[PDB]
Amino acid sequence: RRKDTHIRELEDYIDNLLVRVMEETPSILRVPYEP
Amino acid sequence: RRKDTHIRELEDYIDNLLVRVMEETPSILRVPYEP
Amino acid sequence: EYDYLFKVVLIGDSGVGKSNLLSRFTRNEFNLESKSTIGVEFATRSIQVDGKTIKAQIWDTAGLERYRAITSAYYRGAVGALLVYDIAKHLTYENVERWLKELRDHADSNIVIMLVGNKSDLRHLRAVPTDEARAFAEKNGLSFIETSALDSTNVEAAFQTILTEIY
Amino acid sequence: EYDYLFKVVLIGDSGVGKSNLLSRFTRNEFNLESKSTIGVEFATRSIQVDGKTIKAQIWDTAGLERYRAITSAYYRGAVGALLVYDIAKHLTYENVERWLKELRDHADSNIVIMLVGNKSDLRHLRAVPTDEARAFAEKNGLSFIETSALDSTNVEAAFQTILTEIY
Ligand SMILES: Nc1nc2c(ncn2[C@@H]2O[C@H](COP(=O)(O)OP(=O)(O)OP(=O)(O)O)[C@@H](O)[C@H]2O)c(=O)[nH]1
Numbered sequence: 392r393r394k395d396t397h398i399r400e401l402e403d404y405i406d407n408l409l410v411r412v413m414e415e416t417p418s419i420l421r422v423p424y425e426p
Numbered sequence: 427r428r429k430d431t432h433i434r435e436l437e438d439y440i441d442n443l444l445v446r447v448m449e450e451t452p453s454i455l456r457v458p459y460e461p
Numbered sequence: 462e463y464d465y466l467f468k469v470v471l472i473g474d475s476g477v478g479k480s481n482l483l484s485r486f487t488r489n490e491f492n493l494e495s496k497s498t499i500g501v502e503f504a505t506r507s508i509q510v511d512g513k514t515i516k517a518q519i520w521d522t523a524g525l526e527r528y529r530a531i532t533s534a535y536y537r538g539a540v541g542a543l544l545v546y547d548i549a550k551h552l553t554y555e556n557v558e559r560w561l562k563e564l565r566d567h568a569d570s571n572i573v574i575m576l577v578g579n580k581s582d583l584r585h586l587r588a589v590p591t592d593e594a595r596a597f598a599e600k601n602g603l604s605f606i607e608t609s610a611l612d613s614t615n616v617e618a619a620f621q622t623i624l625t626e627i628y
Numbered sequence: 629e630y631d632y633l634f635k636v637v638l639i640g641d642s643g644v645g646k647s648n649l650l651s652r653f654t655r656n657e658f659n660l661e662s663k664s665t666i667g668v669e670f671a672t673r674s675i676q677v678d679g680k681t682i683k684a685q686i687w688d689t690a691g692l693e694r695y696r697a698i699t700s701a702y703y704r705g706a707v708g709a710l711l712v713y714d715i716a717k718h719l720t721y722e723n724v725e726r727w728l729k730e731l732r733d734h735a736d737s738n739i740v741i742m743l744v745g746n747k748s749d750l751r752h753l754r755a756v757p758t759d760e761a762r763a764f765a766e767k768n769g770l771s772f773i774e775t776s777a778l779d780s781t782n783v784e785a786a787f788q789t790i791l792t793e794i795y
């Protein structure tokens with residue numbers, strides 16, 4: 392019930408984090424991943 | 427049961443992502459965030 | 462090494478086969494028990510077009526009509542889109558009109574778009590006529606192909622055609 | 629700008645006030661409504677030790693650290709650790725030994741550790757006795773102080789002290 396609410400908090404954390412990752416160091420999202 | 431599971435999948439995703447972020451661009455995890 | 466880098470996004474309903482298309486093209490790998498995509502990732506492959514070597518930079522994310530923080534960065538600088546459906550679930554075809562709109566709303570105006578009916582190996586279970594799908598693609602100014610990420614059927618040619626349409 | 633960067637990590641049970649100790653120190657901010665920390669973040673502040681300017685780089689993460697992909701990179705390079713408990717909660721103080729064991733496992737054996745009893749404003753509800761914890765601290769070679777992120781009580785002094793012992 393509020394398991395759903397933690398889920399979207401997590402998802403939203405991923406999205407806000409990914410925005411910054413995409414803008415600054417997108418290479419880290421490459422499959423497969425080379426430093 | 428399946429979304430105990432899904433919460434953790436999300437949580438592991440975050441940790442794997444963060445290991446890479448911490449290792450290559452830790453500044454993105456600074457509060458505040460300067461783009 | 463490469464002459465041009467083309468960013469191409471994968472789009473369409475969850476479960477249609479987007480990530481396995483990506484893994485088929487970039488790695489020649491397929492996963493039957495693949496789960497829904499958490500987050501955003503991409504993979505690359507270089508092809509020949511004209512004299513030229515073109516790095517295809519292919520982006521993948523979950524198919525979700527909901528707004529996300531990541532949307533604008535996902536379409537940003539994307540020069541082509543693969544809009545995919547599962548030929549064995551008419552619903553995923555029904556939702557195409559909405560993904561087109563998503564591209565109208567978010568992608569560049571000149572984005573080359575290719576409609577892709579995937580899972581063509583599921584021919585017992587066909588729910589979506591090819592001929593109809595193709596009339597729809599022709600009508601909406603779209604490239605069109607059917608594929609099987611599982612077979613490899615037309616997977617290379619899908620990617621070849623959009624990239625040649627981009628070059 | 630600054631003569632040394634000292635990385636300092638915050639550890640200790642969930643709910644103890646780790647993220648409010650961070651935002652108190654670095655921004656002079658408190659949130660009564662703060663939720664469990666998703667992920668890993670940090671914030672910095674510069675202070676004077678001796679002649680020198682010292683940037684404290686203060687890391688925060690949730691919870692009760694089960695071994696995460698995160699944990700090894702979290703302690704890596706930490707020269708200090710604020711091991712926090714809630715003075716109004718005996719269990720958070722009981723778990724201090726587990727946290728210490730984590731720094732044996734994961735931090736450089738040289739790390740400066742400071743025991744911090746947080747929420748000294750809940751002096752009515754006190755479940756942990758100041759004197760017991762100070763003896764325990766000293767028994768184990770830890771610094772000790774009690775703080776209130778809410779009141780500000782001893783917060784600047786906690787940080788000032790661990791950095792001084794580090795310096
Ligand atoms: N039979 C068959 N199955 C396929 C084919 N392509 C993908 N699948 C299967 O369909 C399921 C969903 O595939 P995915 O590629 O993970 O789907 P998706 O579009 O990435 O889904 P989202 O992450 O939710 O947007 C998986 O079980 C795949 O193995 C195909 O060409 N033929």
Ligand SMILES: Nc1nc2c(ncn2[C@@H]2O[C@H](COP(=O)(O)OP(=O)(O)OP(=O)(O)O)[C@@H](O)[C@H]2O)c(=O)[nH]1
Nearest residue numbers: 642643645646647648659660664665690691777778
């Ligand atoms: N009364 C009082 N409440 C505090 C104090 N410090 C933190 N709190 C409150 O206690 C609750 C938990 O605080 P947090 O700072 O989010 O705790 P945390 O240790 O980072 O928790 P996790 O992120 O779950 O690991 C929040 O409602 C805080 O506002 C304090 O010094 N006094």
Ligand SMILES: [Mg+2]
Nearest residue numbers: 479480498522
């Ligand atoms: Mg996917």
Ligand SMILES: [Mg+2]
Nearest residue numbers: 646647665689
């Ligand atoms: Mg916290």
